[PDB]
Amino acid sequence: AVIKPDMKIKLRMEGAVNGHPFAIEGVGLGKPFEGKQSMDLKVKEGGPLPFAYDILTTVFNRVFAKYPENIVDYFKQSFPEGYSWERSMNYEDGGICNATNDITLDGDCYIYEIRFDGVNFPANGPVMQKRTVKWEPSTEKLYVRDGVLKGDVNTALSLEGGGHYRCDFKTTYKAKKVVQLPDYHFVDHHIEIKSHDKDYSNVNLHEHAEAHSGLP
Amino acid sequence: VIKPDMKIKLRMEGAVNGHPFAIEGVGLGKPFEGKQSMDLKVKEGGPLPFAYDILTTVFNRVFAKYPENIVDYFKQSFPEGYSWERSMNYEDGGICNATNDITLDGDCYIYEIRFDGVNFPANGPVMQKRTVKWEPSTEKLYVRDGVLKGDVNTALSLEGGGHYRCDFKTTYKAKKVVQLPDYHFVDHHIEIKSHDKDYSNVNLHEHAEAHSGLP
Amino acid sequence: AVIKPDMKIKLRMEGAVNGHPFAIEGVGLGKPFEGKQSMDLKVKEGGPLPFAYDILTTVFNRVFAKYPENIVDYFKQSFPEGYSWERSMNYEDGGICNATNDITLDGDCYIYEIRFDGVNFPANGPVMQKRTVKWEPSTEKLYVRDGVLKGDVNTALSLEGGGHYRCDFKTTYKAKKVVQLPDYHFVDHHIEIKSHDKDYSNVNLHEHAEAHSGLP
Amino acid sequence: AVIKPDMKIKLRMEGAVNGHPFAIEGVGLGKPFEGKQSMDLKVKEGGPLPFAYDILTTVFNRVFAKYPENIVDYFKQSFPEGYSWERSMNYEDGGICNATNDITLDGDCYIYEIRFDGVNFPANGPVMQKRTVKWEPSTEKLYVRDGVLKGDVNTALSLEGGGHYRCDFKTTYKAKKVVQLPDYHFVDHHIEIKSHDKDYSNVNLHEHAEAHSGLP
């Protein structure tokens, strides 16, 4: 087969941050069997965006994750039917973004229908003042609970004058057909904005994900 | 600016676990007595697959009996109005984000509401509609970074007994510069007075009073 | 019956904050059916205390709470056998205090055996720099869960510049004998340090408490 | 260095869980440059522990962690003076265990002074009903904040019937001499209970730990 080594992405996200509506679309490609993808994103509504753009980058597929044969792929097995995922992003200052993404497949393109709502971000915080720099490398903790796969991560965004800005990830992954569940495992993540213009109306995003078994 | 009897109209667009819906309502209240009532119809996404109680608390702090010992942040924001955001954190990890931009037009308050719930479990009292009602509440309001905040710890009484807890974190933003208040409280009691089988029609009621704590 | 209108309190609390041991003993008086109490506390070890004294004042009996006859009092009913209570105080900067109190009766005096452990308090926070002023009045939410009574409340400490420092209280109330459980209700709290010496080696504490069922 | 390839450990921990005191001591050894260490623990007070022994195995030194040399060793740099660490474990059912560890060095053996207090564990939970199996492999994210080193991982316990029980770890590591601080990095952990008596009066503990920079 369903997934070829080279696949494309088309997406469209509609959201709001602190009661600011905005919309972003993006197009990209990514070899999912090596866990790498890249995309180009354009703001279509709500520009210029008044919030730190990184709070969205991780909302922009777990099929781009290098899986070894030891661990069962929940994601590549869900296609061509696809899956849906929900997430709550809890930032240490109380800023909360909840997002959903319904991903489907069309030939060799994964199509995303993404929702995003971020509230309670403080006016003087590093998100509303765009003082973030980068997401650090990450390791996600995936475990099964009540028939579906879940994702838990606590990571941070690197801040401008030094220090880190921490966020707690709680992801629920739901397949659309009945699929085989995996054991407790991990995904190492590294997401980068490799190029952008001034107001982040055009952004180049890059991911790199691999799944592993812990300390061997 | 505020009549003793004020009208009310709203539209809420939202989703729960990625399942969209839309709700509108009209109603009126007495802001100087802290009471309101409204009638709500679902327009899209019906019949809703979640317990109606989770969004019923999103449906104006202006409806709150304020004494002169406490500064009213809400009636002071008017006629320009205010906006409020909220996180409703349920103890099983289901989290609801809500937004409300409130404006005034004559004697009717108009609300533009957003509502998003994620990570709610299939087997929870919200996906199985095991909620009965929200218990009486007391809100803790304090100033932070120029704006007013609201924190409560409350619960839903469940069908077979017991309670289901939610953490409220509310930020209230006025649209003009107004006088900030001291640490105070607002006592809440929200009841759904009437509804049809699939909660396509809902009659809401709320009584709200403010206090300075135990005197 | 059992409990008289005027009862006395004598206690000893042993604890540590960020790994530094200390101990306090205290004696006091109160009227449980009028919900008001007062006691005098003396530091015995670890003095002078290098942390804000306000964090332990909420550990120093819900027997002192005015109950109406329409609400079932769980606390005065569990005497003369007594009860024990458990509690976690999560402070918004990540400092967390764990405390326990085993309460017994000896004639007309309640004896408290308190353990208290606070960890992860940051050096630059209002607790390590003793920038606290007061606890604001509180309303605790009491409900039964799994056979025991519990109490949740979020309060704040009044700071130097009018700011506020919020903490989440999670208390488990366990009686020693079998008593009738109450319905969902509230208890209103007001605790203030009504005197003290310079480094808080001597503290006069007061609390007034009444229980209610909310807005009728 | 005066830290050798083979060092030994001796410790004593005094604590309580839900208000019931206990104390256990242990002796063991390890190799800090390969990240492995074993110990034997004997309960000395507290009867037979009515709680899952797994909750404390994680309180029983990050010097036993394989560091690559382009990551700065914060721990081996704090010796022979030693370091202290504080931590607050948060379990998803609301039970919280707080622990402190004052680590010292004496020749070739590390001495720990451990205090531990957990509270609010419910009777019907996996800790009070001894339904834990083991800790899963975990990935710890360590970062500097306000001059001190921090440790964030939230992980889970694999349960009896296949389920999972997650915990939020918040660790503060404070050295006792001024040492060179590191960049955001990781420590991979795998801790196991290798042998025990029927009531865990004797427990053999093992942990393997290696440090990494994340996904390159």
What's the 3-state SS for A141-176?
EEEEECCEEEEEEEEEEEECCCCEEEEEEEEEEEEC
Do C145 and B163 touch, CB atoms closer than 8 A? Answer: yes
Q: Which residues of D touch C170 (CB under 8 A)?
A: 94, 120
| Per-residue buried b or exposed e for C81-114, using 16+ beta carbons within 10 Å of the residue's own CB | ebbbbbbbbbbbbbbbbbbbbbbbbeeeebebeb
State which H helix or E strand residue D164 sits in.
strand D164-175
Quote the radius of gyration of chain B (alpha carbons, Å). Answer: 17
Do A42 and A202 touch, CB atoms closer than 8 A? Answer: yes
Do D187 and D161 touch, CB atoms closer than 8 A? Answer: no
DSSP B161-201: S-EEEEEEEEEEEESS--PPPPSEEEEEEEEEEEE-TTSSE
Q: Which residues of B touch C208 (CB under 8 A)?
A: 214
Q: How many pairs of residues across A and D have Cβ atoms under 8 Å apart? A: 77
- Report the relative pairing of strands C20-31 and C138-145 from DSSP bridges: unpaired
Q: What CA–CA distance (Å, rounded) separates A52 from A43?
A: 14
Q: Which amino acid, residue B61?
A: R
Cα distances (angstroms) measured from residue D198 to each of A134, D16, D195: 50, 21, 10
Strand partners, B13: B22, B114
Say how many C-beta atoms besides its own lie within 10 A of residue B67's C-beta: 11
Contact (CB<8Å) A98/B93: no
Do B174 and B73 touch, CB atoms closer than 8 A? Answer: yes
Residue located via tokens 């213009």: A197
Cα distances (angstroms) measured from residue C78 to each of C74, C148, C175, D2: 7, 12, 6, 58
Two structure tokens written together for B47: 């019949």
* DSSP label of C215: -
Per the rule left: phi > 0, alpha: psi between -120 and 50, beta: everything else, D25 is beta
Residue located via tokens 């601080």: D181
B187 by Cβ neighbours in 10 Å (0-12 / 13-18 / 19+) ranks as buried
Two structure tokens written together for A151: 């994702």
Output the CA angle A101-A105-A106, nearest 5 degrees.
Answer: 130
Cα distances (angstroms) measured from residue D115 to each of B3, C15, D11, D148: 61, 10, 11, 21
Contact (CB<8Å) B162/C145: yes
Two structure tokens written together for C182: 């109450």
Closest C-alpha to C41, from C175, C172, C199, C210: C199
Phi/psi at B2 (5° precision): -100, 125
Q: What CA–CA distance (Å, rounded) separates D134 from D207?
A: 12
Do C3 and C63 touch, CB atoms closer than 8 A? Answer: yes
Residue located via tokens 């190492």: A188
Residues written for chain D: 216
3-class state of residue D4 by DSSP: coil
Strand partners, B40: B25, B202
Beta-carbon contacts of residue C198 (< 8 Å; ≥ 6 apart): none
Closest C-alpha to C189, from C134, C108, C115: C134
State which H helix or E strand residue A207 sits in.
strand A202-212
Contact (CB<8Å) A123/B99: no
Say how many C-beta atoms besides its own lie within 10 A of residue C6's C-beta: 11
Q: What CA–CA distance (Å, rounded) separates C66 from C35?
A: 4
Cα end-to-end span (Å), chain D: 31
Give the dihedral sign, CA B70/B73/B74/B76. Answer: positive
B88 by Cβ neighbours in 10 Å (0-12 / 13-18 / 19+) ranks as buried
* DSSP label of A19: T
Cα torsion C16, C17, C19, C20 to 10°: value is -70
Residues written for chain B: 215
Contact (CB<8Å) D120/C18: no
Closest C-alpha to D188, from D150, D216, D151, D144: D151
Residue located via tokens 């109603």: B27
Beta-carbon contacts of residue C31 (< 8 Å; ≥ 6 apart): C5, C6, C7, C37, C64
Contact (CB<8Å) D184/A164: yes
Closest C-alpha to A138, from D2, B125, D140, D95: D140
Q: How was this structure determined?
A: X-ray
Q: What CA–CA distance (Å, rounded) separates C170 from C98?
A: 10
Closest CA in chain A for residue D145: A163
DSSP A30-61: E-GGGTEEEEEEEEEESPSP-S-THHHHTT--
Strand partners, C74: none
Closest C-alpha to D93, from B50, C146, C17: C146
Instruction: Strands of B45-146 (E only): list them.
Output: 82-90, 95-105, 108-118, 131-134, 137-144
Give how far the C-alpha of residue B132 lies from the chain's centroid of Cα atoms, to the nearest Å.
17
Please tell me which chains touch B, using 3 or more CB pairs under 8 Å as the contact test: A, C
Range of the domain at A174: 1-216
* DSSP label of D57: H
Two structure tokens written together for D202: 């004797």
Known binding residue C212? Answer is no
Per the rule left: phi > 0, alpha: psi between -120 and 50, beta: everything else, D168 is beta
Q: Which residues of A touch D186 (CB under 8 A)?
A: 137, 139
* DSSP label of D201: S
Q: Which of A51, A100, A144, A153 to substitute to test the interface with B, most B CBs within 10 Å?
A: A100
Contact (CB<8Å) B188/C215: yes
Do B48 and B15 touch, CB atoms closer than 8 A? Answer: no
State which H helix or E strand residue C76 sits in.
helix C74-77
3-class state of residue A181 by DSSP: coil
User: Considering its fold, how many domains does chain D have in total?
Assistant: 1
Closest C-alpha to D109, from D12, D4, D1: D4
Q: What CA–CA distance (Å, rounded) separates B91 from B16?
A: 17
Q: What CA–CA distance (Å, rounded) separates B78 from B69?
A: 20
Cα distances (angstroms) measured from residue C112 to each of A134, A191, C6, C103: 51, 54, 17, 5
Task: Specify binding-site residues of D for Cu(2+).
Answer: 196, 206, 208
Beta-carbon contacts of residue D210 (< 8 Å; ≥ 6 apart): A215, D35, D65, D66, D187, D188
Say how many C-beta atoms besides its own lie within 10 A of residue A175's C-beta: 21
Phi/psi at B69 (5° precision): -80, -20
Q: Which residues of B touch A170 (CB under 8 A)?
A: 93, 95, 119
Say how many C-beta atoms besides its own lie within 10 A of residue B192's C-beta: 17
State which H helix or E strand residue C188 sits in.
strand C185-196
Q: What CA–CA distance (Å, rounded) separates D65 from A127?
A: 34
Closest C-alpha to B89, from A94, C86, C156, A19: A94
* DSSP label of C181: P
Closest C-alpha to C7, from C104, C81, C80, C107: C107
- Report the relative pairing of strands C109-119 and C7-17 from DSSP bridges: parallel
3-class state of residue C54 by DSSP: helix
State which H helix or E strand residue B55 sits in.
helix B53-56
Two structure tokens written together for A12: 């469209």
Q: Under an 8 Å CB criterion, which residues of C touch D? A: 16, 18-19, 84, 86-88, 90, 94, 96-100, 102, 115, 117-120, 122-124, 146-147, 170, 172
Residue located via tokens 């579906």: A148
Quote the radius of gyration of chain A (alpha carbons, Å). Answer: 17
State which H helix or E strand residue A97 sits in.
strand A96-106
Q: What CA–CA distance (Å, rounded) separates C144 from B178?
A: 42
Strand partners, A60: none
Strand partners, D111: D10, D104
- Report the relative pairing of strands D109-119 and D7-17 from DSSP bridges: parallel
Q: What CA–CA distance (Å, rounded) separates A151 from A170?
A: 6
Q: What CA–CA distance (Å, rounded) separates D57 from D204?
A: 10
Beta-carbon contacts of residue C79 (< 8 Å; ≥ 6 apart): C2, C3, C63, C105
Two structure tokens written together for D25: 């001591």
Q: What CA–CA distance (Å, rounded) separates B37 from B6?
A: 11
3-class state of residue B151 by DSSP: strand
Q: What CA–CA distance (Å, rounded) separates D212 from D71?
A: 8
Q: What CA–CA distance (Å, rounded) separates C116 from C15?
A: 4
Do B179 and B80 touch, CB atoms closer than 8 A? Answer: no
Q: What CA–CA distance (Å, rounded) separates D186 from A40?
A: 30
Closest CA in chain C for residue D83: C19
Strand partners, C68: none
Peptide bond preceding C80 in cis form (omega within 30 of 0): yes
Closest C-alpha to B65, from B37, B28, B36: B36
Phi/psi at A53 (5° precision): -70, -20
Phi/psi at B76 (5° precision): -80, -20
Beta-carbon contacts of residue B4 (< 8 Å; ≥ 6 apart): B30, B31, B32
**Closest Cα of chain D to A48: distance in Å?**
31
Number of helices (H), then strands (E), in chain B: 1, 12
Do B104 and B9 touch, CB atoms closer than 8 A? Answer: no
- Report the relative pairing of strands C96-106 and C83-91 from DSSP bridges: antiparallel
Q: What CA–CA distance (Å, rounded) separates B63 from C215?
A: 14
Give the number of C-alpha atoms closer than 13 A to the C-alpha of residue B134, restricted to the C-beta side. 30
Do B109 and B6 touch, CB atoms closer than 8 A? Answer: yes
* DSSP label of D104: E
Give how far the C-alpha of residue C85 lies from the chain's centroid of Cα atoms, to the nearest Å.
10
Q: Which residues of A touch D166 (CB under 8 A)?
A: 143, 152
Closest C-alpha to C164, from B83, A119, D145, B145: B145
Q: Which residues of C touch D18 (CB under 8 A)?
A: 86, 100
Q: 3-state SS of chain C: helix, strand, coil percent to 5?
A: 5, 55, 40
Q: What CA–CA distance (Å, rounded) separates C181 from C176?
A: 13
Beta-carbon contacts of residue B185 (< 8 Å; ≥ 6 apart): B138, B139, B140, B141, B210, B211, B212, B213, C137, C139
Closest C-alpha to D212, from B100, A78, A137, B164: A137
Q: What CA–CA distance (Å, rounded) separates A27 from A11?
A: 6
Nearest to A137 among D137, D153, D214 (CB): D214
Q: What CA–CA distance (Å, rounded) separates A92 from B175?
A: 27
* DSSP label of B76: G
Cα distances (angstroms) measured from residue C24 to each of B214, C80, C118, D216: 28, 25, 15, 53
Cα end-to-end span (Å), chain B: 32
Two structure tokens written together for D39: 């110990």
State which H helix or E strand residue D143 sits in.
strand D138-145
Give the number of C-alpha atoms closer than 13 A to the C-alpha of residue C160, restricted to the C-beta side. 7
State which H helix or E strand residue C175 sits in.
strand C164-175
Closest C-alpha to B61, from B47, B48, B76, B46: B76
Q: What is the CATH number of the domain that holds B189?
A: 2.40.155.10
Beta-carbon contacts of residue D169 (< 8 Å; ≥ 6 apart): D58, D87, D88, D89, D90, D140, D151, D152, D153, D154, D155
Residues written for chain A: 216
3-class state of residue D189 by DSSP: strand
Q: What CA–CA distance (Å, rounded) separates A92 from C92?
A: 9
Q: What CA–CA distance (Å, rounded) separates C189 from B32?
A: 27
B148 by Cβ neighbours in 10 Å (0-12 / 13-18 / 19+) ranks as buried
Closest C-alpha to B25, from B41, B37, B13, B14: B41
B160 by Cβ neighbours in 10 Å (0-12 / 13-18 / 19+) ranks as exposed
